Amino acid sequence: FVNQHLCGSHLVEALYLVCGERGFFYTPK
Amino acid sequence: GIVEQCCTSICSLYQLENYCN
């Protein structure tokens, strides 16, 4: 699921699945 | 940033993990 173009909700979903209990930051600017 | 690396171009696990806390 990670080795592709990921935009918008699709990118946030990948971050969520990869990072698990760590969480993540989404900084599109 | 992440949009240029993962949306405009092909993402990777390596790069996604740079945005985990």
Residue numbers in the entry:
A (entry chain BBB): 1 to 29
B (entry chain AAA): 1 to 21
Any passages from the paper?
ID23-2 is a fixed-energy (14.2 keV) microfocus beamline at the European Synchrotron Radiation Facility (ESRF) dedicated to macromolecular crystallography. The optics and sample environment have recently been redesigned and rebuilt to take full advantage of the upgrade of the ESRF to the fourth generation Extremely Brilliant Source (ESRF-EBS). The upgraded beamline now makes use of two sets of compound refractive lenses and multilayer mirrors to obtain a highly intense (>1013 photons s−1) focused microbeam (minimum size 1.5 µm × 3 µm full width at half-maximum). The high flux density of ID23-2 makes analysis of microcrystals the most common use for the beamline.
However, the microbeam is also routinely used to attain higher multiplicity datasets from larger single crystals. In this example, a large (300 µm × 50 µm × 50 µm) cubic insulin crystal was used to collect 3600 frames helically with heavy attenuation, yielding a flux of 1 × 1011 photons s−1 at an oscillation step of 0.1° with 30 ms exposures, in 7/8 multibunch mode with 200 mA ring current. SHELXC/D/E and CRANK2 were used for phasing and density improvement, followed by cycles of manual building in Coot and refinement in REFMAC5. Strong contrast was observed between the two hands in SHELXE, with a final CC of the partial model of 41.5% after two automatic building cycles. Calculation of a model phased anomalous difference map in ANODE revealed peak heights of S positions of 14.9, 14.9, 12.9, 12.9, 12.7 and 12.6 for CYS 19B, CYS 20A, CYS 7A, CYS11A, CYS 7B and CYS 6A, respectively. Experimental electron density is shown in Fig. 6.
